[PDB]
Amino acid sequence: LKENDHARFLQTAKNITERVSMATASSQVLIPEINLNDTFDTFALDFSREKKLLECLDYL
Numbered sequence: 001l002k003e004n005d006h007a008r009f010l011q012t013a014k015n016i017t018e019r020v021s022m023a024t025a026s027s028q029v030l031i032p033e034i035n036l037n038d039t040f041d042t043f044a045l046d047f048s049r050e051k052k053l054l055e056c057l058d059y060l
Contacts, residue, residue, distance in 0.1 A: 013051040020047045 020043070024030050030040045052058060 009055050013055040016051045016054070017044065017047055020044060 021030070024040060024043060029036055029043075031037075
């Protein structure tokens with residue numbers, strides 16, 4: 001369903017988690033080792049939270 005509303009909203013949610021991945025990738029902090037996984041995870045996660053609030057609605 002590619003429209004002039006939903007499509008734009010999607011491009012955003014993706015551009016959010018897509019921009020972070022590219023950044024972290026360069027920093028070289030997206031692989032396991034000792035305590036990096038916990039960092040990358042908590043990193044992307046937080047980002048996603050913002051994506052949802054943008055794409056769809058939420059309570060908290």
